[PDB]
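In practice, a research group might receive sequence data for several interacting partners and want a quick structural hypothesis before committing to experiments. The following worked case mirrors that situation: the sequences arrive first, and a predicted assembly follows.
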Amino acid sequence: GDPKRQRKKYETPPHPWIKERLDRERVLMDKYELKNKKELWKHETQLKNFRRRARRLLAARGKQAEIEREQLLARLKRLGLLPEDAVLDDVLSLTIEDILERRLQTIVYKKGLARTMRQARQLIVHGHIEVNGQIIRSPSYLVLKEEEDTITYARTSPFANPQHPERMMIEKA
Amino acid sequence: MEIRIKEIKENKLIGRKEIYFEIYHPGEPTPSRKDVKGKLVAMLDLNPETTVIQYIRSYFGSYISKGYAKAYDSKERMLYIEPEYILIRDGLIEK
Amino acid sequence: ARKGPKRHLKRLAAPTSWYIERKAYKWAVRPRPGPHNMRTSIPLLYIVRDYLGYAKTAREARKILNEGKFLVDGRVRKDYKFPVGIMDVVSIPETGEHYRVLPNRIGKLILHPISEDEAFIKPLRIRNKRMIKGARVQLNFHDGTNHIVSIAEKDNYFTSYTVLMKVPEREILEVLPFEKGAYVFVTQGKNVARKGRIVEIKRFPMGWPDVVTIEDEEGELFDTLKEYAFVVGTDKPKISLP
Amino acid sequence: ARGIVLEKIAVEAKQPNSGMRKAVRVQLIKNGKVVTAFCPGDGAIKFIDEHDEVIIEGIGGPKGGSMGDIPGIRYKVVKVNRVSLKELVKGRKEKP
Amino acid sequence: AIWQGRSLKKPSGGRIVLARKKRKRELGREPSNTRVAEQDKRKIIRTYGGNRKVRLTAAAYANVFDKSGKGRKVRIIRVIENPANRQFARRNIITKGAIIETEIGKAKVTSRPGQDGVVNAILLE
RNA sequence: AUUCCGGUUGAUCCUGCCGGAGGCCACUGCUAUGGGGGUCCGACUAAGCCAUGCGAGUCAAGGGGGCGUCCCUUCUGGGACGCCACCGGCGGACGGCUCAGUAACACGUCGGUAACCUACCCUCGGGAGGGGGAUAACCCCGGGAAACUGGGGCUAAUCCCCCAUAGGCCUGGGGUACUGGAAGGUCCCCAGGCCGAAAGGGAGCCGUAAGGCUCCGCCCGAGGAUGGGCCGGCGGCCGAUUAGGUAGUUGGUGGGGUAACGGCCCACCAAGCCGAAGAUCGGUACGGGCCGUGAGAGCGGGAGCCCGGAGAUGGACACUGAGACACGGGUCCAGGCCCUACGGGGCGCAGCAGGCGCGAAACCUCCGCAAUGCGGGAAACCGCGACGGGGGGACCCCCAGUGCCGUGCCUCUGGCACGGCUUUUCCGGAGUGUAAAAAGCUCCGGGAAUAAGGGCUGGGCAAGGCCGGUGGCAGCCGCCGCGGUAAUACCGGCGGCCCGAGUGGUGGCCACUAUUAUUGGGCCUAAAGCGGCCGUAGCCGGGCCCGUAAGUCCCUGGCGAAAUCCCACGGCUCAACCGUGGG
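A structural hypothesis for the assembly, expressed as tokens:
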């Protein structure tokens, strides 16, 4: 009899040094400008959990099984990882890049609010980005589809002024 | 500083009125208890000597600060019900 | 290391029938002995504070209770540890509010608003019947309450019957028998908070409890215990039980 | 474990290896048992004198036993006089 | 005191080791040897939970009933037999199974003098 | 990720083990900028020993007094107002701490008590009649070094005692009125007996009085409710280099005792009872919910949070109470201490802080009853090292920083020069926050300013055929294996590769390991078929028909606490965390 112990939310690679895995992870890190490998492993295990849930639900029968299947599909569609007309089979086709593209940093960069991923990360950390009115300072936050169009400069941040030198530099792109 | 009264309730067992409100304000210091009480009393037509602000709580990276207050019917009832610490904080007793 | 009765109750160990936050704090009110069981009861403090939100602190709740502002079964209750059980009428005259305590579909206790005219009626299931000194018959109800009648009226009451009592005067209004077609309400078990009409009764050897089958409005047949089958009418419920 | 250095000794590397490995004899404070502890480092031996208080720790080897070409030695010195032996040999600290 | 707890031997002949100290609720009392005398002697004992017991140590009168519910208070003379103990008959000790003889003949005890403090008996036909 | 790679040879294929590679827990080297959430922090060795402080109090609406203020009538004395102590009531048997002992009905689950007790609380049906007596406080006088304690007088009660009636128990003879599945139960009528109640006390508002209204009270009976006691079926370690164990032992009859049934005990009658399906004896250990690991089967642990059980230096005993044979109550022995004016008298932190010892191994001698809850009170309210708040700590988990942009140069996975921008974080202020603080959250001012280390570099395994030192010596090496004067393998510099507020070393568990093999291993030559056969328990057993349904399968009621686990939604900025529903 032992009490609860809070667990890690990421899984380390089975072998620290594999050439192909190291090269692939290095490419992903360079592309998405993540701070360290634990963030990438966190997203990888998120994808793994989704895939495991889909695999378990595929071969399950029962009202609870149908409810869980519907909830999984609805949650993925809400997160924006799958189209509206998706099916459970389409879950297994998800890739790490799909999750990486939903990060607040990536969406901020894509929307043209920052010249580069590093600039977007600094903006998020310093609180120049507001999501649905709230200011979120977590670059790894997964933006929901329903609120993807509400991301913009904080109404009090200097970046909100169109005449700001940094804003003009960003717009010059 | 704009105060929006989200909810108002009438407690009759305890002869008071509970007011939940939200203070919207662009970048500015968190409003002081004296200013909040004065504005609330002026807006809602309450007795100044019978209103106690339970709290004015601000959140992370937000321009809306929530606030909870109570307005009693009787000063004696207010003294009998409210604890000493909240009244001292609101400056109703000289301490 | 145990030498006598307990006086405390940890929140994690509180009964599952309470709408309580089991992790906000450590202790919970330990109900005093009273009418109903531990499982089918809740201290009046939680009704005053959590369920209704008339007070924000236990001190305020105790002050209001001591001021005699809350009536249970038509009698003012002042202690904050008084158990409140199923089929109980909670009255707040000052706000003119009247609630009936009933189980939920998941076994939790809830307050169902009732009418002022209906607030004067309490159903009581005859848990037991016996004879006492003299020639009088004593009836023991589900909430531990007792009533006394004469030997002449012995056949007017039986176990599992229901009695409508006018509170606080404690006067008999009507007797609902337990028989086929009698409307019943399930008080606990898997089929709690379900209602229907009696269809069949089954007995078993030794001390095994009786089993009763109930037909619901939609026509579905389910089973439960005779003791769990609470009679609340004859053809249509006389007490609002939604 | 903790112990007191009794004497400093040397052992011969096994065949085909050839060399002197410098160890110490340590008496445990727990029960007074005497064991042999190897001193890791290029010049670790000169940093240990008799009657010195040392901390010994298992030596990484198969089945939690001996290591490399020095069987009969199961422990290595980690700290001498409550100071790290690695730090002393590397030169960032002075032996108290 | 007179412990009345569990036995220390299993039915298989093994040995049991106490896992706890003796508890107060498990204690008994000394036997009450009701003796025939010239005057009744009784005492009051406070028992578990605050209840009460009346212990009769010396018995002089007996309530004897004869097949019709007619009870008589008759003095006890001697104990003829007592199957409970082989020495109680000789020691003149009254017991729930004892047989006595009173002014109106032989009777058999039917009560427990040490538990209710009364000697009741049925006449022998 | 349901996985492999290195090592027996001149070279090959096997068996077999050893080592790498992953997760978790405990110590530990080097190193360290922040914020949140949690059930983390003297469990492993000593359930070893403790200085000092605190951890259980409350009631003036039960009673008589002392002190002080006031209104006074006025030597009298009346009344308010507070403070103090005493008697008196309740509580102190809960909570808090530890895992020593225990292989046991201790624990888990399902049932039984028709064989039993219970203050506090709820309902109903009843009662409160007449007397009597001490003593605390106070006063006089002390004794004793202290700790304690004597004598005399004067008082009150919800203090104590007695009488009376209701009521309680036992037994004998009759009727069957009730609940139950079934009455040694309950109800009614006679008879013999034992035992045997109360406080109409207190407070407020009216009333000329009388009397009235209300609030908290007292006793008995029948039921509940709350907390328990006892009992039964089933379930969960290793040793046969432990094969016999038992004599109140197993059962009976008759009794005693208990609150209760019982060899629990007693008096007699019998020879019963347990055991290779492992008794007895010995080793180890608090049991469970659960946790760690694994794709799963499974293996291993079961200190922190919840439930249950035991203990209060090691034993043994009793008093008061509903409840104890009682951690901060009592008596004796053993063991260790303290004061003494030598006669004598006291103590045991496995309670919160703190100290010694033991060790590889673990923190402040802090603030508050503001929230939750408990005891007391009619209530306001008081106390609570429980709890809540903070302090120290590389306890676990979650979210971030140690800048960004444009141009130009360069030995371009980066560095440098120039011109701009942000303040996460740091520093100084105002609010909000808090029982009061602090931390957090909003805002104002200065400014890239305050912030990167640890191992490794021959393969297994990502990373140098570069330079200097040593020349079987120093040394390295989990394994293979390097070093003997051209060392990619040792030391150092310059480069590089892994992770990153972490990174290394040691012990332990799981996978690796189909090297424990039910899923799922082997036994001709590598470990292993008894030298051979006969046969008892056990295991596995030809075909068809009929019958029962014990196993088996399907459906449906009562259970298997909560927390923990998975899914969806909602609240703290998302998350960690918590709530609402389903599983």
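Before designing any experiment, note the following. Chain A has one domain: 16-173. Chains A and E do not touch (no CB pair under 8 Å).
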